[PDB]
Coordinates of C-alpha atoms (C1' of nucleotides) and ligand atoms in Angstrom, one line a residue:
Chain A
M134 CA 24.4 8.4 -30.7
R135 CA 27.0 9.0 -28.0
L136 CA 28.6 5.7 -29.0
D137 CA 28.4 6.4 -32.7
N138 CA 29.7 10.0 -32.8
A139 CA 32.6 9.1 -30.5
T140 CA 36.3 8.7 -31.1
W141 CA 38.8 6.3 -29.5
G142 CA 42.4 6.9 -28.6
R143 CA 45.4 4.8 -27.7
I144 CA 45.3 1.9 -25.3
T145 CA 48.0 1.8 -22.7
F146 CA 49.2 -1.0 -20.5
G147 CA 50.3 -0.2 -16.9
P148 CA 49.0 -0.1 -13.4
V149 CA 45.6 1.5 -12.6
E150 CA 44.3 2.3 -9.1
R151 CA 40.5 2.1 -9.2
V152 CA 38.6 3.8 -6.3
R153 CA 35.2 2.6 -5.5
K154 CA 33.0 5.7 -5.8
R155 CA 29.3 6.3 -5.9
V156 CA 28.6 7.5 -9.4
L157 CA 25.7 8.2 -11.7
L158 CA 25.2 5.4 -14.2
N159 CA 23.3 7.0 -17.0
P160 CA 23.0 10.7 -17.9
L161 CA 19.6 12.3 -17.3
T162 CA 17.3 14.9 -18.9
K163 CA 16.9 16.6 -15.6
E164 CA 17.8 15.2 -12.1
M165 CA 14.8 15.3 -9.8
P166 CA 13.9 13.5 -6.5
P167 CA 11.7 10.4 -7.0
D168 CA 8.5 11.9 -5.6
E169 CA 8.9 15.1 -7.5
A170 CA 9.7 13.1 -10.7
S171 CA 6.6 11.0 -10.0
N172 CA 4.6 14.2 -9.8
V173 CA 6.1 15.3 -13.1
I174 CA 5.3 11.9 -14.8
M175 CA 1.7 12.1 -13.4
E176 CA 1.3 15.5 -14.9
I177 CA 2.7 14.4 -18.3
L178 CA 0.8 11.1 -18.7
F179 CA -2.2 10.9 -16.4
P180 CA -3.1 14.5 -15.6
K181 CA -6.6 14.0 -14.3
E182 CA -5.2 11.7 -11.5
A183 CA -2.3 13.8 -10.3
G184 CA -4.3 14.7 -7.1
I185 CA -3.1 17.6 -5.0
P186 CA -0.9 20.1 -7.0
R187 CA 2.7 20.6 -5.8
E188 CA 5.0 23.5 -6.5
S189 CA 7.0 21.2 -8.9
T190 CA 4.5 21.8 -11.7
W191 CA 5.4 25.5 -12.0
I192 CA 9.2 24.7 -11.9
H193 CA 8.9 21.9 -14.5
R194 CA 6.3 23.5 -16.8
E195 CA 8.5 23.6 -19.9
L196 CA 9.7 20.0 -19.4
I197 CA 6.1 18.9 -19.1
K198 CA 5.1 20.9 -22.2
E199 CA 8.0 19.5 -24.2
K200 CA 7.4 15.9 -23.0
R201 CA 3.7 16.3 -23.9
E202 CA 4.7 17.6 -27.3
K203 CA 7.0 14.7 -27.9
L204 CA 4.7 11.9 -26.8
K205 CA 1.8 13.3 -28.8
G206 CA 0.1 10.6 -30.9
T207 CA 1.9 7.3 -30.0
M208 CA 0.1 4.0 -29.5
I209 CA 2.6 2.7 -27.0
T210 CA 0.9 1.8 -23.7
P211 CA 1.4 4.4 -20.9
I212 CA 3.1 1.9 -18.6
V213 CA 6.0 1.8 -21.1
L214 CA 6.0 5.6 -21.4
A215 CA 6.1 5.9 -17.6
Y216 CA 8.9 3.4 -17.4
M217 CA 11.0 5.3 -19.9
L218 CA 10.2 8.7 -18.4
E219 CA 11.2 7.4 -15.0
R220 CA 14.3 6.0 -16.7
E221 CA 15.3 9.4 -18.0
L222 CA 14.4 11.5 -14.9
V223 CA 15.1 9.5 -11.8
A224 CA 18.8 8.9 -11.0
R225 CA 20.6 5.6 -10.6
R226 CA 23.6 6.1 -8.4
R227 CA 25.7 3.1 -7.5
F228 CA 29.2 2.2 -6.2
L229 CA 31.5 1.4 -9.0
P230 CA 35.3 1.2 -9.3
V231 CA 36.3 4.4 -11.0
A232 CA 39.8 5.6 -12.1
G233 CA 40.0 8.8 -14.1
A234 CA 36.6 9.9 -15.3
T235 CA 33.4 9.8 -13.3
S236 CA 30.9 11.7 -15.4
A237 CA 27.8 9.7 -16.6
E238 CA 28.8 9.6 -20.2
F239 CA 32.0 7.8 -19.1
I240 CA 30.3 5.6 -16.5
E241 CA 28.1 4.2 -19.3
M242 CA 31.3 3.0 -20.9
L243 CA 33.3 2.1 -17.7
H244 CA 33.4 -1.5 -18.8
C245 CA 35.5 -0.6 -21.9
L246 CA 37.3 2.5 -20.4
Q247 CA 40.0 1.0 -18.1
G248 CA 40.7 -2.2 -16.3
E249 CA 43.1 -3.1 -13.5
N250 CA 46.1 -3.2 -15.8
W251 CA 45.1 -1.2 -19.0
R252 CA 43.5 2.1 -20.0
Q253 CA 41.7 3.2 -23.1
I254 CA 41.4 6.9 -24.1
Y255 CA 37.8 7.6 -25.2
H256 CA 35.8 10.8 -25.8
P257 CA 32.0 10.4 -26.2
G258 CA 29.6 12.3 -28.4
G259 CA 27.3 15.1 -27.5
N260 CA 28.7 18.1 -25.7
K261 CA 30.5 18.3 -22.4
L262 CA 29.3 20.6 -19.7
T263 CA 30.9 23.6 -18.0
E264 CA 30.9 22.5 -14.3
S265 CA 32.5 19.2 -15.2
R266 CA 35.0 21.1 -17.4
Chain B
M15 CA -24.1 15.0 21.9
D16 CA -24.8 12.5 19.2
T17 CA -28.6 11.9 19.3
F18 CA -28.9 15.5 18.2
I19 CA -26.8 14.7 15.0
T20 CA -28.7 11.4 14.6
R21 CA -32.1 13.0 14.5
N22 CA -31.2 16.3 12.8
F23 CA -29.4 15.0 9.7
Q24 CA -29.8 12.2 7.3
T25 CA -27.6 9.1 7.4
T26 CA -25.6 10.1 4.2
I27 CA -24.4 13.4 5.7
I28 CA -23.4 11.7 9.0
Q29 CA -21.5 8.9 7.2
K30 CA -19.7 11.3 4.9
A31 CA -18.7 13.5 7.8
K32 CA -17.5 10.5 9.8
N33 CA -15.3 9.4 6.9
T34 CA -14.1 13.0 6.4
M35 CA -13.0 13.0 10.1
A36 CA -11.4 9.5 9.7
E37 CA -9.4 10.7 6.8
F38 CA -7.7 13.3 9.0
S39 CA -7.0 10.7 11.7
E40 CA -9.6 11.8 14.2
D41 CA -12.4 10.2 16.3
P42 CA -16.1 11.1 15.8
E43 CA -17.3 9.5 19.0
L44 CA -15.0 11.7 21.1
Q45 CA -15.4 15.0 19.2
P46 CA -19.0 16.1 18.5
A47 CA -17.8 19.6 17.8
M48 CA -15.9 18.9 14.6
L49 CA -18.4 16.3 13.5
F50 CA -21.2 18.9 13.9
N51 CA -19.1 21.5 12.0
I52 CA -18.6 19.1 9.1
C53 CA -22.3 18.1 9.1
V54 CA -23.3 21.8 9.0
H55 CA -20.8 22.4 6.2
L56 CA -22.0 19.5 4.1
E57 CA -25.7 20.3 4.7
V58 CA -25.0 23.9 3.5
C59 CA -23.1 22.7 0.5
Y60 CA -25.9 20.2 -0.4
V61 CA -28.8 22.7 0.2
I62 CA -27.1 25.3 -2.1
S63 CA -26.5 22.7 -4.8
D64 CA -29.9 21.0 -4.4
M65 CA -32.1 21.7 -7.4
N66 CA -30.2 24.2 -9.7
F67 CA -30.1 22.8 -13.2
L68 CA -28.8 23.7 -16.7
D69 CA -30.9 22.3 -19.6
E70 CA -29.7 21.4 -23.1
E71 CA -29.5 25.1 -24.0
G72 CA -27.7 25.9 -20.8
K73 CA -30.2 28.1 -19.1
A74 CA -30.4 27.8 -15.3
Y75 CA -33.6 26.9 -13.5
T76 CA -34.5 26.0 -9.9
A77 CA -37.0 23.2 -9.9
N86 CA -32.9 16.9 -15.7
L87 CA -29.8 14.9 -15.0
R88 CA -27.2 17.6 -15.3
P89 CA -27.2 20.0 -12.2
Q90 CA -25.6 23.4 -12.1
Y91 CA -23.2 22.7 -9.3
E92 CA -20.8 19.8 -8.7
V93 CA -20.1 19.1 -5.0
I94 CA -16.4 18.5 -4.3
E95 CA -16.6 18.7 -0.5
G96 CA -17.8 15.5 1.0
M97 CA -16.1 13.0 -1.4
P98 CA -12.9 11.3 -0.5
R99 CA -9.7 13.2 -1.0
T100 CA -8.5 11.3 -4.0
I101 CA -11.9 11.4 -5.7
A102 CA -12.4 15.1 -4.9
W103 CA -9.0 15.9 -6.3
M104 CA -9.8 13.8 -9.4
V105 CA -12.9 16.0 -9.9
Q106 CA -10.9 19.2 -9.3
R107 CA -8.1 18.1 -11.7
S108 CA -10.7 17.1 -14.3
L109 CA -12.8 20.3 -14.1
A110 CA -9.7 22.5 -14.1
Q111 CA -8.1 20.7 -17.1
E112 CA -11.3 20.6 -19.1
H113 CA -12.5 24.2 -19.0
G114 CA -9.0 25.7 -19.0
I115 CA -9.4 27.3 -15.6
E116 CA -6.1 27.0 -13.7
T117 CA -6.1 24.4 -10.9
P118 CA -6.2 26.0 -7.4
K119 CA -3.7 25.0 -4.7
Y120 CA -6.5 24.0 -2.3
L121 CA -9.7 22.0 -2.4
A122 CA -12.9 23.9 -3.2
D123 CA -16.3 23.0 -1.9
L124 CA -18.5 23.5 -5.1
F125 CA -18.1 24.0 -8.8
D126 CA -20.5 26.2 -10.8
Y127 CA -21.0 25.1 -14.5
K128 CA -22.7 28.3 -15.4
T129 CA -20.0 30.7 -14.2
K130 CA -17.6 27.8 -14.5
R131 CA -15.9 28.8 -11.2
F132 CA -14.9 27.1 -8.0
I133 CA -17.1 28.2 -5.2
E134 CA -15.7 27.8 -1.7
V135 CA -18.0 28.0 1.3
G136 CA -17.0 29.0 4.8
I137 CA -19.0 28.9 8.1
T138 CA -18.3 31.4 10.9
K139 CA -20.2 32.7 14.0
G140 CA -19.1 36.4 14.0
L141 CA -18.6 39.0 11.2
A142 CA -19.0 37.3 7.8
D143 CA -16.8 40.0 6.3
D144 CA -14.1 39.0 8.9
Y145 CA -14.1 35.4 7.8
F146 CA -14.3 36.6 4.2
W147 CA -11.0 38.5 4.6
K148 CA -9.6 35.5 6.6
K149 CA -10.2 33.4 3.5
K150 CA -8.8 36.1 1.2
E151 CA -5.6 36.1 3.4
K152 CA -4.8 32.6 2.0
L153 CA -6.7 32.3 -1.3
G154 CA -6.1 35.4 -3.5
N155 CA -8.3 35.6 -6.6
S156 CA -8.3 31.9 -7.3
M157 CA -11.8 30.9 -6.0
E158 CA -15.1 32.5 -5.2
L159 CA -16.6 32.8 -1.7
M160 CA -19.9 32.1 0.0
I161 CA -19.5 33.0 3.7
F162 CA -22.4 32.7 6.1
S163 CA -23.1 32.9 9.8
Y164 CA -25.8 31.9 12.4
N165 CA -27.3 35.4 12.8
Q166 CA -28.6 36.2 9.2
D167 CA -25.2 37.8 8.2
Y168 CA -23.8 36.5 5.0
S169 CA -21.1 37.7 2.6
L170 CA -21.1 36.5 -1.0
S171 CA -18.4 36.9 -3.6
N172 CA -17.9 39.9 -5.9
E173 CA -18.6 37.7 -9.0
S174 CA -21.4 35.6 -7.4
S175 CA -24.7 34.4 -8.9
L176 CA -26.5 33.1 -5.7
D177 CA -30.3 33.6 -5.8
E178 CA -32.6 34.3 -2.8
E179 CA -34.6 31.1 -2.5
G180 CA -31.6 29.0 -1.4
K181 CA -30.3 32.1 0.5
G182 CA -33.5 32.0 2.5
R183 CA -33.3 28.2 3.1
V184 CA -29.6 28.2 4.2
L185 CA -30.1 31.0 6.8
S186 CA -33.4 29.4 8.0
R187 CA -31.6 26.1 8.5
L188 CA -28.7 27.8 10.3
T189 CA -31.0 29.7 12.6
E190 CA -33.1 26.6 13.3
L191 CA -30.0 24.7 14.1
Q192 CA -28.9 27.5 16.5
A193 CA -32.3 27.5 18.2
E194 CA -32.3 23.7 18.7
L195 CA -28.7 23.8 20.0
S196 CA -29.7 26.5 22.5
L197 CA -32.9 24.7 23.4
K198 CA -31.2 21.6 24.7
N199 CA -28.2 23.5 26.2
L200 CA -25.7 22.4 23.6
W201 CA -24.2 25.6 22.3
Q202 CA -21.9 25.6 25.4
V203 CA -20.4 22.3 24.1
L204 CA -19.7 24.1 20.8
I205 CA -18.2 27.2 22.4
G206 CA -15.6 25.1 24.2
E207 CA -13.0 23.1 22.3
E208 CA -13.1 19.3 22.6
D209 CA -9.3 18.9 22.3
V210 CA -7.5 15.6 22.7
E211 CA -4.5 14.1 20.8
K212 CA -5.3 11.3 18.4
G213 CA -2.0 9.6 19.2
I214 CA -1.0 6.1 18.1
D215 CA -2.7 3.5 20.1
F216 CA -1.6 -0.2 20.5
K217 CA -3.2 -2.3 23.2
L218 CA -1.7 -5.6 24.1
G219 CA -4.5 -8.2 24.7
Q220 CA -4.7 -11.1 27.1
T221 CA -2.9 -13.9 25.2
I222 CA 0.0 -11.8 24.0
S223 CA 0.6 -10.3 27.5
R224 CA 0.7 -13.8 28.9
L225 CA 3.1 -14.9 26.2
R226 CA 5.3 -11.9 26.8
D227 CA 5.3 -12.6 30.6
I228 CA 6.4 -16.2 30.1
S229 CA 8.9 -15.2 27.4
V230 CA 11.3 -13.5 29.8
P231 CA 14.7 -14.8 30.9
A232 CA 15.2 -16.9 34.0
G233 CA 15.0 -14.8 37.2
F234 CA 12.0 -12.6 36.4
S235 CA 8.4 -13.3 37.3
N236 CA 6.6 -11.0 34.9
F237 CA 7.6 -8.7 32.0
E238 CA 7.5 -5.4 33.8
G239 CA 10.1 -6.6 36.3
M240 CA 12.4 -7.4 33.4
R241 CA 11.7 -4.1 31.7
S242 CA 12.4 -2.1 34.8
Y243 CA 15.5 -4.2 35.5
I244 CA 16.7 -3.2 32.0
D245 CA 15.8 0.4 32.5
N246 CA 17.1 1.0 36.0
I247 CA 20.3 -1.0 36.9
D248 CA 23.8 -0.3 35.7
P249 CA 25.5 -3.5 34.5
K250 CA 29.1 -2.1 34.4
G251 CA 31.6 -4.7 35.5
Chain C
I53 CA 17.2 -32.3 18.8
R54 CA 20.4 -30.3 18.4
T55 CA 18.6 -27.2 19.6
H56 CA 17.4 -28.8 22.7
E57 CA 20.7 -30.6 23.3
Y58 CA 22.7 -27.3 23.4
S59 CA 20.3 -25.8 26.0
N60 CA 19.1 -28.8 28.1
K61 CA 20.7 -27.4 31.3
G62 CA 18.2 -24.5 31.6
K63 CA 14.8 -24.0 33.1
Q64 CA 12.2 -26.4 31.7
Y65 CA 8.4 -25.7 32.0
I66 CA 5.1 -26.2 30.4
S67 CA 3.4 -23.2 28.9
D68 CA 0.0 -22.1 30.2
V69 CA -1.0 -20.7 26.8
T70 CA -0.4 -23.6 24.4
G71 CA 0.7 -26.5 26.6
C72 CA 4.0 -27.1 24.9
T73 CA 7.3 -27.9 26.7
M74 CA 9.5 -24.8 26.8
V75 CA 13.2 -24.6 27.7
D76 CA 15.0 -21.5 28.9
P77 CA 18.8 -21.3 28.6
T78 CA 19.0 -17.6 29.2
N79 CA 20.6 -16.9 32.6
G80 CA 21.3 -20.6 32.8
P81 CA 24.6 -21.9 34.2
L82 CA 27.9 -21.1 32.7
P83 CA 29.5 -23.8 30.4
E84 CA 32.3 -26.1 31.5
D85 CA 33.5 -27.3 28.1
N86 CA 33.8 -26.3 24.5
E87 CA 30.4 -27.8 23.5
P88 CA 28.2 -25.1 21.9
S89 CA 26.3 -23.6 24.8
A90 CA 23.2 -21.3 24.5
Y91 CA 23.4 -20.1 28.1
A92 CA 23.6 -16.4 27.4
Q93 CA 24.0 -14.2 30.5
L94 CA 21.7 -11.1 30.6
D95 CA 24.1 -8.8 32.3
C96 CA 26.9 -9.5 29.8
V97 CA 24.5 -8.6 26.9
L98 CA 23.3 -5.5 28.6
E99 CA 26.9 -4.4 29.4
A100 CA 27.8 -5.0 25.7
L101 CA 24.9 -2.9 24.5
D102 CA 25.7 -0.2 27.0
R103 CA 29.3 0.0 25.8
Chain D
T671 CA 7.0 -9.4 -29.8
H672 CA 9.9 -11.3 -28.0
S673 CA 8.6 -10.0 -24.7
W674 CA 6.2 -13.0 -24.4
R675 CA 5.3 -14.7 -21.2
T676 CA 5.3 -18.5 -20.5
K677 CA 2.0 -20.3 -19.8
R678 CA 0.7 -21.0 -16.3
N679 CA 1.7 -24.3 -14.8
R680 CA -1.5 -26.4 -15.1
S681 CA -0.8 -28.9 -12.4
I682 CA -3.5 -27.2 -10.3
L683 CA -6.2 -28.5 -12.7
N684 CA -6.0 -31.9 -11.1
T685 CA -5.6 -31.0 -7.4
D686 CA -8.2 -29.7 -4.9
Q687 CA -7.4 -26.1 -5.6
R688 CA -9.3 -25.6 -8.9
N689 CA -11.7 -23.2 -7.3
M690 CA -8.7 -20.9 -6.7
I691 CA -8.6 -20.6 -10.5
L692 CA -12.1 -19.2 -10.6
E693 CA -11.3 -17.2 -7.4
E694 CA -8.5 -15.6 -9.3
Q695 CA -10.5 -14.8 -12.4
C696 CA -13.2 -13.2 -10.2
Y697 CA -10.5 -10.9 -8.9
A698 CA -8.8 -10.1 -12.2
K699 CA -11.9 -9.0 -14.0
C700 CA -12.6 -6.5 -11.2
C701 CA -9.0 -5.2 -11.4
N702 CA -9.2 -5.2 -15.2
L703 CA -12.1 -2.8 -14.9
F704 CA -10.4 -0.7 -12.3
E705 CA -7.4 0.1 -14.5
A706 CA -10.0 0.8 -17.2
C707 CA -11.4 3.6 -15.1
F708 CA -8.2 4.7 -13.3
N709 CA -5.4 4.5 -15.9
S710 CA -2.7 5.5 -13.5
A711 CA -3.2 2.5 -11.3
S712 CA -0.4 0.6 -12.9
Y713 CA 2.1 3.3 -12.3
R714 CA 0.8 4.9 -9.0
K715 CA -0.4 2.9 -6.1
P716 CA -4.0 3.8 -5.4
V717 CA -4.6 5.2 -2.0
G718 CA -8.0 5.4 -0.2
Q719 CA -10.2 3.8 2.5
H720 CA -13.4 4.0 0.4
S721 CA -14.7 1.0 -1.6
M722 CA -13.5 0.0 -5.1
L723 CA -17.1 0.4 -6.4
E724 CA -17.6 4.0 -5.1
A725 CA -14.4 5.3 -6.7
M726 CA -15.3 3.7 -10.1
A727 CA -18.9 5.0 -10.0
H728 CA -17.7 8.5 -9.2
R729 CA -15.1 8.3 -12.0
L730 CA -17.7 7.1 -14.5
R731 CA -20.2 9.8 -13.5
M732 CA -17.6 12.5 -14.0
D733 CA -16.5 11.0 -17.3
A734 CA -20.1 10.9 -18.5
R735 CA -20.7 14.5 -17.4
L736 CA -17.6 15.8 -19.1
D737 CA -18.6 13.7 -22.2
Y738 CA -22.0 15.4 -22.5
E739 CA -20.5 18.8 -21.8
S740 CA -18.2 18.5 -24.8
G741 CA -20.5 17.0 -27.5
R742 CA -18.8 13.5 -27.4
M743 CA -22.1 11.9 -26.3
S744 CA -25.7 12.1 -27.3
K745 CA -28.7 13.3 -25.3
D746 CA -30.0 9.7 -25.2
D747 CA -26.8 7.8 -24.6
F748 CA -26.1 10.2 -21.7
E749 CA -29.5 9.2 -20.3
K750 CA -28.6 5.5 -20.7
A751 CA -25.3 6.0 -18.9
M752 CA -26.9 8.0 -16.1
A753 CA -29.7 5.4 -15.8
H754 CA -27.2 2.6 -15.5
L755 CA -25.2 4.6 -12.9
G756 CA -28.5 5.3 -11.1
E757 CA -28.9 1.5 -10.8
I758 CA -25.4 1.2 -9.5
Chain E
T310 CA 43.7 -11.7 12.0
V311 CA 41.3 -14.5 12.8
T312 CA 39.4 -15.8 9.8
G313 CA 36.4 -17.1 11.6
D314 CA 33.2 -19.0 11.2
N315 CA 30.4 -19.4 13.7
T316 CA 29.1 -22.9 14.3
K317 CA 25.5 -23.6 15.2
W318 CA 24.5 -20.0 14.9
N319 CA 20.8 -20.5 14.4
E320 CA 20.3 -23.1 17.2
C321 CA 22.3 -21.4 19.9
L322 CA 20.9 -17.9 19.8
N323 CA 17.7 -16.9 21.7
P324 CA 14.6 -14.8 21.3
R325 CA 14.8 -14.1 25.0
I326 CA 18.0 -12.2 24.4
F327 CA 16.5 -10.4 21.4
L328 CA 13.6 -9.3 23.6
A329 CA 16.1 -7.7 26.0
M330 CA 17.8 -6.1 23.1
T331 CA 14.5 -4.6 21.8
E332 CA 13.9 -3.4 25.4
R333 CA 17.3 -1.8 25.6
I334 CA 17.4 -0.1 22.2
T335 CA 14.0 1.4 22.5
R336 CA 14.6 3.0 25.9
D337 CA 13.6 6.6 25.1
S338 CA 10.7 5.7 22.8
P339 CA 6.9 5.9 23.5
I340 CA 5.3 3.0 25.2
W341 CA 3.3 1.9 22.2
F342 CA 6.4 1.5 20.1
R343 CA 8.0 -0.4 22.9
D344 CA 5.0 -2.8 22.9
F345 CA 5.2 -3.1 19.1
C346 CA 9.0 -3.8 18.9
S347 CA 8.6 -6.5 21.7
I348 CA 6.2 -8.9 19.9
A349 CA 8.5 -10.6 17.3
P350 CA 10.8 -12.1 20.0
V351 CA 7.7 -13.1 22.0
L352 CA 6.2 -15.0 19.0
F353 CA 9.7 -16.4 18.3
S354 CA 10.3 -17.6 21.8
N355 CA 7.0 -19.6 21.7
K356 CA 7.3 -20.9 18.1
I357 CA 6.2 -24.4 17.1
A358 CA 8.2 -26.3 14.4
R359 CA 6.0 -28.2 11.9
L360 CA 8.0 -31.2 11.0
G361 CA 7.2 -31.9 7.3
Chain F
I156 CA -7.7 -10.6 5.4
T157 CA -10.8 -12.3 4.0
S158 CA -10.9 -14.6 7.0
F159 CA -10.4 -11.8 9.4
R160 CA -13.4 -10.1 8.0
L161 CA -15.6 -12.9 9.3
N162 CA -14.6 -12.2 12.9
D163 CA -15.2 -8.4 13.2
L164 CA -11.5 -7.8 12.6
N165 CA -11.1 -4.9 10.2
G166 CA -7.6 -3.5 10.5
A167 CA -7.1 -4.0 6.8
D168 CA -9.7 -1.6 5.7
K169 CA -8.0 1.3 7.5
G170 CA -5.0 0.8 5.3
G171 CA -2.2 1.2 7.9
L172 CA 0.1 -1.5 9.1
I173 CA -0.5 -0.7 12.8
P174 CA -4.3 -1.4 12.8
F175 CA -3.6 -4.7 10.9
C176 CA -1.0 -5.8 13.5
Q177 CA -3.5 -4.7 16.2
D178 CA -6.1 -7.1 14.7
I179 CA -3.4 -9.8 14.4
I180 CA -2.6 -9.6 18.1
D181 CA -6.3 -9.3 18.9
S182 CA -7.1 -12.5 17.0
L183 CA -5.0 -14.4 19.6
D184 CA -7.7 -13.5 22.1
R185 CA -10.6 -14.7 19.9
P186 CA -12.1 -17.9 21.4
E187 CA -13.0 -19.3 17.9
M188 CA -11.7 -18.5 14.4
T189 CA -13.8 -18.9 11.3
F190 CA -12.2 -19.2 7.9
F191 CA -12.8 -20.3 4.3
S192 CA -11.6 -23.9 3.6
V193 CA -12.5 -26.4 0.9
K194 CA -14.1 -29.8 1.4
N195 CA -15.1 -32.2 -1.3
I196 CA -18.5 -33.7 -2.2
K197 CA -18.7 -36.9 -4.2
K198 CA -21.2 -37.5 -7.1
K199 CA -22.5 -40.5 -8.9
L200 CA -22.6 -40.6 -12.7
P201 CA -24.3 -43.7 -14.3
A202 CA -23.0 -45.0 -17.5
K203 CA -22.2 -48.3 -19.2
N204 CA -19.1 -49.4 -17.2
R205 CA -17.6 -51.8 -14.8
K206 CA -17.1 -51.8 -11.0
Chain G
rA1 C1' 31.5 18.3 -2.4
rA2 C1' 27.3 15.9 -2.9
rU3 C1' 22.2 14.0 -4.1
rG4 C1' 19.9 7.1 -0.3
Chain H
rA1 C1' 18.6 -53.0 -13.1
rG2 C1' 20.2 -48.2 -12.7
rU3 C1' 20.8 -43.0 -11.4
rA4 C1' 21.9 -41.7 -6.9
rG5 C1' 23.3 -40.9 -1.6
rU6 C1' 21.1 -40.3 5.1
rA7 C1' 15.9 -40.5 0.4
rA8 C1' 13.9 -40.6 -3.5
rC9 C1' 12.9 -41.7 -8.9
rA10 C1' 12.2 -45.9 -11.9
rA11 C1' 5.1 -41.9 -14.0
rG12 C1' 1.1 -39.6 -11.0
rA13 C1' -4.3 -38.4 -10.8
rG14 C1' -9.4 -39.0 -12.4
Chain I
rA1 C1' -10.8 -45.6 -19.2
rC2 C1' -5.7 -49.4 -25.1
rC3 C1' -10.3 -42.6 -22.5
rU4 C1' -8.9 -37.8 -20.5
rC5 C1' -5.8 -34.3 -17.5
rU6 C1' -0.5 -33.2 -15.8
rG7 C1' 5.4 -32.3 -15.9
rC8 C1' 8.0 -26.7 -10.0
rU9 C1' 2.2 -26.3 -7.3
rU10 C1' 3.2 -27.6 -1.8
rC11 C1' -1.4 -32.8 1.6
rU12 C1' -3.1 -30.0 8.8
rG13 C1' -8.3 -32.2 8.2
rC14 C1' -12.4 -34.5 4.6
rU15 C1' -9.2 -40.6 4.8
Ligands
MG801 MG1 -13.0 22.0 1.4
MG802 MG1 34.4 -16.4 7.4

RNA sequence: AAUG
RNA sequence: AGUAGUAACAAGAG
RNA sequence: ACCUCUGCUUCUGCU
């Protein structure tokens, strides 16, 4: 959807200085530490095996209720649901050459954004934040 | 003090108490105090939950294959928290932060037991310092002084048997001069232990550079001298 | 063969654990040519780690 | 349907390691019952020093109890389940 | 700038130097960790190559 | 692990790496080691055949 | 500014 | 033969 | 046995 509802601009040729920075690859629903996100996934999918309750259940109660509403009556096996929930909660942060934009909606199109000698003006779909603005 | 525990409790209670100590990284052969405390705790939790039963209509009786209480204390930590998560998620009662010792299917409440030696109301309020109104309470002591919870349903047959067992345990501890071992604390650190055997010590001795006879000479030469220049 | 050739000027002995023939080049003699030598000096390594 | 897996290399059927086939399929059955009882075992690593039979027997006993306390079993099939668990 | 390669790197090192390194690095550690970190150079200084 | 069980070496049941490495370096002091290996036993089948 |  | 290159294949096993 | 298995499945010892 962020690809489809996007618009493209001019392409310019000229020098580009890329700086290798540690950026977030894909945008997230909510950025959590991996053990806290594992506790969230165990509360969403396998609630009778979550073990000792943390304090993360009270912070993330609306996310758990929403994600239990959305995955209501599906027949997809829970290992795939856990893989996709871990895909949309746990961050992937890697070192990439970045010139210009480093938000995750631009890092997911960094291959077609700019190169070493060209730049492409691009604006993704969705809605941009306020801290990034 | 271990033949006391060997003759006074069944093998199941002793094995469960030893595994309970081993889960918290302790040693049962070197601490009979904590082993005795967990054996007394499990014996109380099993005598209370001995023969209370709900029938197909759900009426309790003390004399079926569905008991009134489910024992959480005694099982391994992952299994006991599985039982607590399941019983909290099924009946709708909110999951407590800590691990209760029994579950009552009639009141449908988590019943936590404590064991003290002084004022039962004192240990009652010591538990209420950290619990709140999330569990029930069954506090007992060795001198016929109990303190049950304000929404309790404990009868007086098991209340006779529990205090009779506690007083008989106290009398047999004092008869063989063993209460003095339980007054004092058997405190030692269960630090990480790693003993080098015979072959690996010989291999480490012969695996030193040229100029050293054993390994401790090389180790103290590394630690002591200053090789500057 | 190449491992024992580059360290044959060290201390040879027979192990009293397994029985095999062991060679010790560490704190052996200093080299005299540009052959690959495995005679590492212990004080030089300890001075490097201390720096 | 394009996430298939290739077949196992069957060169071991002629060597001296054919018992390691059976020795694998004795393991797998046990694990394929364990993830039946503990569904989170594929996502979470199971922790514990107790046996693999004790954990499964306790999980099956609690499942049968919370089945009979919700009407999802009979009064007779509950007796069959608890008799089998009394054997185990 | 020297563009360099190291010849005979695996044959000319020593487990007896790595033992001294694991005794120098773990100076201020407990004794059990110093006995743990000084077993891999011991098993590597007495290794036996199977030929093939 | 299944061969260490036959020698009263049980650092794998406790679940940590440190008791397992303790049993590893204590198996070097064991005078004998028992393990599971595989031999072969031959068998005659009569038929209508040659040789 | 980060999130190992 | 040939591929190949410090040692193999040019079918192996029952 | 013009029968069967195999195509990355490792050979210390049964040899
Ligand atoms: Mg408890
Ligand atoms: Mg280079």
